[PDB]
DNA sequence: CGCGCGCGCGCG
DNA sequence: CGCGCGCGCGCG
């Protein structure tokens, strides 16, 4: 859903750098639902992630 | 939700042995939501699983 | 054991897709891939890319 | 390297919880556990149970 | 189409 | 409280 993606981006716009944990717990969505859209949004260059070895990816808006 | 668990058990009652795949695709729920309740239902002895090494667990009602 | 058979296929045929390997060895694609990625971690095999192509060392 | 330090702690102190290990080694619990379970798979260490307790061989 | 994935995990 | 988990994976 576009609505889910809107809410994910709005969360990132409000909070900045975040793991899937911060996002899904706040939005009250499944972790998997959020990750699906995070990786989808990464593909369309709307979000980006940084990953330290063996750590949860950290996400933020490209803008 | 109890409703989710009801639907999972009803699926199993109708179809018998199933992986999380069969269930979540039919119920239109996230795989994680279904697995959460499967493992919860396993704990309360309402469902059981069999697992061949390196394969998806197969689930069925205890009854 | 499975890893032995995989490395042996590679040792004989060289560059191979997972498809080449599982077809010959009569094994599940997922099984062969699980072992290839573990062998990759072991620095025993490597892939080129997808349709990855695998080979020894 | 981390696995070296873990096995060395075990070699010196014997039966240890992940808590014992990470506190001494100054490492994340998740890091130590990831390596213990890999060493378990390697048949290098084993656990008794939870609060698992770990030791060599 | 890359896929190795089992995973439930929320955990502080 | 066991937790190692990263995981997005839907894939045929």
Residue numbers in the entry:
A (entry chain B), B (entry chain B): 7 to 69
C (entry chain A), D (entry chain A): 9 to 57, 61 to 68
Describing publication, verbatim:
PKZ interacts with CpG repeats, the DNA sequence that is more prone to adopt the left-handed helical conformation of Z-DNA. We expressed and purified the PKZ Zalpha domain (DrZalphaPKZ) encompassing residues 5–70 of zebrafish PKZ (DrPKZ). The protein was crystallized with an oligonucleotide forming a self-complementary (CG)6 DNA duplex with a single T base overhang and resulted in crystals belonging to two different space-groups growing under similar conditions.
On the other hand, the hexagonal form shows a 4 bp distance between binding sites with two monomers contacting the central part of the DNA helix and two interacting with the duplex edges. The Arg62 of the extended wing of monomer B of DrZalphaPKZ forms an additional interaction with the backbone of G6 of the same strand. Also in this case, the monomers positioned at the edge of the DNA are missing these interactions. In our structure, the centrally positioned monomers symmetrically contact each other. The interaction involves the N-terminal edge of α3 of the two monomers and consists of two symmetric salt bridges between Glu36 and Arg42 and hydrogen bonds involving Thr39, Glu36 and Ser38. The guanidinium group of Arg42 is in an interesting arrangement as its Nε also forms a hydrogen bond with the DNA backbone phosphate oxygen.
